[PDB]
Structures are given as C-alpha cells and as structure tokens.
Amino acid sequence: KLLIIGTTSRKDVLQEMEMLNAFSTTIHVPNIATGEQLLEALELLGNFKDKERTTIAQQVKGKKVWIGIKKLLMLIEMSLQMDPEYRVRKFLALLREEGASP
Amino acid sequence: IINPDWNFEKMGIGGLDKEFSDIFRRAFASRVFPPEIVEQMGCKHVKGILLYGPPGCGKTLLARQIGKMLNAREPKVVNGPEILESEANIRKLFADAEEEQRRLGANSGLHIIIFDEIDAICKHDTVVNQLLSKIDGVEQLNNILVIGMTNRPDLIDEALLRPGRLEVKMEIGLPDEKGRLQILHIHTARMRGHQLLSADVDIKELAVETKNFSGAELEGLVRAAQSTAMNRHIKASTKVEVDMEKAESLQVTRGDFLASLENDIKPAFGTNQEDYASYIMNGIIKWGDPVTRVLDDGELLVQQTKNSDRTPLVSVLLEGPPHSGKTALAAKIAEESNFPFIKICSPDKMIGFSETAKCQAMKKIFDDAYKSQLSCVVVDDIERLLDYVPIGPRFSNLVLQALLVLLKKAPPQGRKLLIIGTTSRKDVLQEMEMLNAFSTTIHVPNIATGEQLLEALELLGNFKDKERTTIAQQVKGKKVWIGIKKLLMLIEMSLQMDPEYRVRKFLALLREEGASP
Numbered sequence: 131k132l133l134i135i136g137t138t139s140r141k142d143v144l145q146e147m148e149m150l151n152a153f154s155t156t157i158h159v160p161n162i163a164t165g166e167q168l169l170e171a172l173e174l175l176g177n178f179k180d181k182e183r184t185t186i187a188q189q190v191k192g193k194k195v196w197i198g199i200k201k202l203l204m205l206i207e208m209s210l211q212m213d214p215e216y217r218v219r220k221f222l223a224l225l226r227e228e229g230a231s232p
Numbered sequence: 233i234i235n236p237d238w239n240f241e242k243m244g245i246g247g248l249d250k251e252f253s254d255i256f257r258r259a260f261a262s263r264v265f266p267p268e269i270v271e272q273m274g275c276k277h278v279k280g281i282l283l284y285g286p287p288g289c290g291k292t293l294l295a296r297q298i299g300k301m302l303n304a305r306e307p308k309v310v311n312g313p314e315i316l317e318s319e320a321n322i323r324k325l326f327a328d329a330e331e332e333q334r335r336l337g338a339n340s341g342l343h344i345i346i347f348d349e350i351d352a353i354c355k356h357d358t359v360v361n362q363l364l365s366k367i368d369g370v371e372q373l374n375n376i377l378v379i380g381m382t383n384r385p386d387l388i389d390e391a392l393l394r395p396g397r398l399e400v401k402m403e404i405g406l407p408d409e410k411g412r413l414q415i416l417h418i419h420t421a422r423m424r425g426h427q428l429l430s431a432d433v434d435i436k437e438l439a440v441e442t443k444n445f446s447g448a449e450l451e452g453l454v455r456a457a458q459s460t461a462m463n464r465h466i467k468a469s470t471k472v473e474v475d476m477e478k479a480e481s482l483q484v485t486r487g488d489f490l491a492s493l494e495n496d497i498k499p500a501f502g503t504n505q506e507d508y509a510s511y512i513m514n515g516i517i518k519w520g521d522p523v524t525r526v527l528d529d530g531e532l533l534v535q536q537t538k539n540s541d542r543t544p545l546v547s548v549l550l551e552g553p554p555h556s557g558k559t560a561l562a563a564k565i566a567e568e569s570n571f572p573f574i575k576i577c578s579p580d581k582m583i584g585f586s587e588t589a590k591c592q593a594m595k596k597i598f599d600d601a602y603k604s605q606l607s608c609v610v611v612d613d614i615e616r617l618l619d620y621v622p623i624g625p626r627f628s629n630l631v632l633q634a635l636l637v638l639l640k641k642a643p644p645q646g647r648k649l650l651i652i653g654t655t656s657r658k659d660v661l662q663e664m665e666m667l668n669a670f671s672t673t674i675h676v677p678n679i680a681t682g683e684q685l686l687e688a689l690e691l692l693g694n695f696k697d698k699e700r701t702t703i704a705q706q707v708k709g710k711k712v713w714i715g716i717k718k719l720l721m722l723i724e725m726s727l728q729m730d731p732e733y734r735v736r737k738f739l740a741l742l743r744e745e746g747a748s749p
C-alpha cells in the first residue's frame with residue numbers, strides 16, 4: 131500500500147495541464163478572514179498585552195482582513211523591534227499597508 | 233537513560249557529556265567486566281572508532297582523558313606523513329602488541345594506537361592494503377584498539393568502515409554560548425584561586441561575544457589577557473618610584489580581556505572579509521531625509537535577524553530608478569552589520585560565464601555562507617544577472633529557478649542568515665512572480681527639488697558664491713529629476729570647460745537631462 135500527498139499554489143495552471151484527473155481528491159486551506167480569528171491568533175501567540183489588545187480590537191473591528199499566517203508572524207516580529215510607545219502604531223500601519231482585496 | 237555519574241569538570245572536559253557517555257557505553261563497556269561473563273554473554277569487543285569535525289574542538293583530549301582513567305598504560309600516537317620502508321615503520325607499532333600476545337593474550341592489557349589525519353594516508357593502495365590486513369588479518373589481535381581522526385570523513389575508504397572493523401562514528405562540532413560558558417568556567421581555574429582577575433569581570437559577556445571560537449582560542453584569550461595585564465601594571469609601576477606592590481595592586485584584570493580580544497586573537501573558522509572602497513568610492517553624503525530613512529530601516533532589519541527565534545531567515549529588496557545609488561547603500565549597510573562572515577556576489581566577476589558555471593558559483597557561495605553562525609550575503613543587479621533584454625524574453629530559465637529555490641532554503645538548526653538584493657526593473661520581476669519570495673521592499677527615490685540640488689552642490693563644494701546664486705535663481709523651481717551618480721558625472725564633465733564658460737555649460741547639460749519621471 132502507498133499514499134501520495136502533493137502541495138501547490140497555482141491550481142488553474144495545473145487544471146489546464148490535465149493533472150487534476152490523476153489526483154483523487156483535493157482539500158482547500160483558507161486565509162484569515164475575520165477580526166475574531168486574528169484576535170484569537172494574537173492571544174494564542176501571547177505577545178501583546180491586554181491594553182494593546184483592546185486598542186487593536188477597537189481599531190480593527192471596522193474593516194476586513196485578508197492575510198496569511200506566515201506574513202502575520204513576520205509582521206509581528208518586525209513590529210516588536212520598535213520602542214514600546216509605537217509598537218501598536220507600527221503594527222497597525224503595516225497591517226493597513228499589507229491589506230488587499232481577496 | 234541510566235548511566236554512571238562522572239565528574240566532567242574534574243577531568244577538564246566541558247560541554248560534551250552526551251558524546252563521552254555514549255562513546256563509553258558503546259565502545260569500552262565490554263573490556264571492564266571480567267572475561268568469564270564476557271564469554272558467557274557471547275560479547276565481541278569493538279576494534280575501531282572514528283571522530284570527525286572542525287579542528288581544535290578537542291578530539292584528542294577525550295581519548296587522553298579516557299586513557300588517564302582507563303586504568304591502563306598511555307596511548308601511542310602516529311602521524312599521517314610519519315609512516316609515509318613503510319612496512320618497517322608498521323612493524324614499530326604492532327610489534328609491541330604482538331610481543332605482549334606472545335607473552336599474554338587471554339588476560340593481557342589493552343593497547344591503543346592513535347592516527348592523526350588518517351585521510352591523508354588512505355583514499356597509495358599499498359599502505360591501505362597493509363593497514364587493512366593488519367587490523368583484521370589471518371591473525372586476530374585481541375589487545376589492540378584504533379581511534380582514527382580526520383576532518384573530511386567523505387574521503388575515507390569504504391572498506392575501512394565495514395561493520396566488522398571500525399563501526400562507531402561521531403561528530404564533534406563547534407561550541408555554543410552555553411558550551412563556551414562552561415569551557416571558560418573550566419579554563420578559569422588557576423587564576424580563580426590566585427585572585428589575579430578582577431571581580432568586575434563578567435564571563436557571561438565574554439561567552440556571548442565570542443561567536444566563532446574554539447577551545448584553543450578560548451584558552452589563548454586567557455593567556456593573552458594575563459600577559460597584557462602583567463605587562464600593563466608592571467610597566468606602569470616601573471617607570472615611577474611608587475611602591476612595587478602598587479603594580480601588584482593592579483594585578484586584578486577587568487578590561488584587559490577586551491584589550492586582547494580587539495585584535496590579538498581572531499576566529500579561524502569561516503570569517504571572510506570584503507573590501508568596501510571598490511563599492512563606496514565617493515563615500516556617502518546626506519542630501520535629504522531618505523538616506524536617513526533607508527539607513528534606519530536597514531539597521532532595524534539587521535537588529536531583528538540577531539535576537540529573533542521565529543525568523544531564522546530574512547530577505548530584503550531595494551528598488552529605484554537607475555543610478556540612484558542602491559549598491560553603495562547596500563554595501564554600507566553590510567559593512568555596518570559587523571557580522572563575522574560577509575561576502576558579495578556580483579556579475580562583474582562573472583564575465584563570459586556559462587549559465588551552469590554561474591549556478592555553481594551561486595551555490596558554492598551559499599554553501600560557504602551556511603558554515604558560519606552568522607553571515608550576510610549581497611546579490612546585485614538581479615535583472616542583469618538573469619540576462620534580460622527588452623526585445624522579447626531571453627531570461628536564462630535555469631538561473632531564475634536556482635535563485636527562486638535558493639531564496640527560501642533555511643539553514644541548519646541554530647544558524648541565521650540575511651539576504652539583500654538590489655534591482656531597478658521592478659515590473660519585470662513582478663511578472664516572474666519572484667517578488668513574493670522576498671519579505672519587504674524599501675524605495676530609493678531620486679532628487680525632486682531644487683533646494684536638494686543646491687544642498688548637494690554645497691556639500692560637494694565645487695561652485696562659488698556667485699555661481700551658486702546664479703544656479704539657485706535659474707533652477708529655483710522644484711521640478712528637477714536627477715540621481716546622485718548622474719549629478720556627479722555631469723559636474724565632472726562640466727568642470728572641463730574654461731572658467732568663463734562653465735555655469736552655462738552646466739545649465740545646458742542639466743536642461744538636456746530629464747525633469748520628470
């Protein structure tokens with residue numbers, strides 16, 4: 131017996147080459163698409179404090195979010211470098227800059 | 233796992249408890265229990281061991297300690313070129329063991345032979361065959377042991393590693409912060425009881441600072457520091473008629489460690505250096521905020537990649553209009569990094585090379601970079617390195633795929649890296665989808681205001697007061713579009729005319745150039 135697992139990021143190109151016929155089934159992994167999920171991830175990572183968490187939740191609860199997990203880790207690590215005063219501002223600015231339509 | 237506790241600090245070994253314990257359990261356990269139960273087991277004694285790794289980490293000292301505590305005689309040593317008539321020398325090593333086996337062999341002691349740089353004497357098939365016959369020939373030597381060492385195990389003959397003969401292999405790699413701490417704790421013993429050192433000394437800082445340091449370098453640190461301090465205070469008190477013990481009152485050492493560390497001893501492994509004059513010829517002159525902004529962003533990136541655990545790899549891309557001075561800024565940041573290992577890969581060294589050769593050079597550079605606990609590698613002119621051309625495409629697909637695969641491969645555990653690239657054709661790169669491989673982008677704009685041009689001119693200091701006023705009034709409008717390199721060469725050309733016909737020539741040259749993106 132055997133089992134083969136594949137990974138890809140360009141589904142349409144594979145579709146044109148008549149490749150999906152060989153594969154028996156496909157599974158879809160989505161991105162973060164709600165403020166609640168982002169807040170849960172931030173809490174689980176255990177980086178920001180309570181007050182900054184409240185500020186982030188208040189500011190981010192009036193827009194849409196579409197971001198990948200690895201990019202989120204990179205943004206958190208980059209933002210932590212700045213001084214304690216401007217960490218939240220830098221993180222929010224970077225999130226706004228990265229924000230894009232699905 | 234259960235083990236018999238040892239006192240490593242007492243034996244002088246630090247940071248290798250696991251290796252010592254495993255070696256002792258797998259190799260020398262049998263030869264300590266009495267022959268009767270050994271035979272009843274059916275146990276068979278091992279005959280050879282192999283140790284490999286960077287030089288100076290202390291391969292010999294491990295077996296020397298085992299010999300000191302082996303409750304037997306001392307081990308004999310051989311050298312790679314010593315044997316290299318050969319059979320006569322071979323008969324000077326096992327002849328003593330053969331004589332013992334003539335006088336003994338059932339209850340005889342244990343003889344140990346040590347081979348240095350064994351790879352140099354085996355790959356000359358005559359000596360290899362003689363050695364192979366001797367270790368396992370028609371006669372069986374049950375009172376001998378061989379412990380080879382080298383640094384390139386891949387070059388050892390396979391027949392020598394057949395399971396019947398040598399069967400244990402180990403790697404002894406460079407120390408880490410905690411390992412360096414323990415090694416220093418061990419080496420700082422005599423002066424610890426002699427009170428020749430200062431109480432302000434912080435061994436933690438010394439251990440943290442030394443990135444690529446072997447035990448030999450660590451001991452040399454202590455040697456040089458004590459020498460520096462003795463000379464310092466003795467000489468200080470010799471030229472004055474002050475009390476002699478005043479010098480001995482300064483015997484305690486706090487800053488001499490740093491003094492010796494500055495340039496007395498330097499890392500031996502990796503530790504490449506690069507020249508920056510060839511890439512920074514006119515220095516760096518501040519003509520506006522953007523230079524400060526770029527430098528600050530580069531410094532922040534350099535800081536993140538040193539005190540972070542979740543991001544052991546960081547890449548950054550610089551983009552801007554041609555001749556904006558991106559390569560110089562990248563080289564300046566790389567120099568300011570202060571990392572032990574630095575290198576630059578540029579197409580200038582690659583002239584007329586084939587695509588495969590370029591791929592080989594790139595992979596070799598990255599492979600060398602992997603060897604160091606820190607590094608920074610710079611790649612310049614990506615669009616040229618791909619051999620682009622506007623008339624249709626001509627990119628070398630192989631060179632593109634090599635880069636795209638390389639940019640993501642993380643290093644082994646515990647090693648960090650930083651990658652910086654510089655480009656000018658951003659759209660073309662975006663087309664190939666490689667833009668997503670990078671993590672961040674920093675812009676390199678061009679001069680866009682007149683006052684910036686006058687400030688650059690005054691920093692350069694070439695035009696006089698009247699000429700400065702004339703240019704300022706002529707181009708007061710903030711509708712300029714010029715790069716630092718273009719400004720430099722334009723000024724250099726314009727300076728070639730006669731003193732009278734210079735300002736007008738400069739203005740004509742500026743007008744010839746563009747004024748908008």
Ligand SMILES: Nc1ncnc2c1ncn2[C@@H]1O[C@H](COP(=O)(O)OP(=O)(O)OP(=O)(O)O)[C@@H](O)[C@H]1O
Binds near residue numbers: 512556558560561720
């Ligand atoms: N503040 C500065 N910024 C950039 N370059 C400067 C600065 N001060 C002086 N220079 C000099 O300007 C010249 C431009 O630098 P460099 O050769 O790296 O340009 P570039 O835009 O990377 O070139 P290319 O178009 O060939 O890619 C160099 O001589 C550099 O020393």
Ligand SMILES: Nc1ncnc2c1ncn2[C@@H]1O[C@H](COP(=O)(O)OP(=O)(O)O)[C@@H](O)[C@H]1O
Binds near residue numbers: 247290291292415447
């Ligand atoms: N774990 C360790 N404990 C004590 N000393 C060490 C250790 N590792 C390296 N050294 C230092 O390395 C030196 C010995 O290296 P050596 O055995 O000659 O290496 P090789 O024989 O492979 O050239 C000694 O000066 C010793 O202080």
Ligand SMILES: [Mg+2]
Binds near residue numbers: 559
């Ligand atoms: Mg350049």
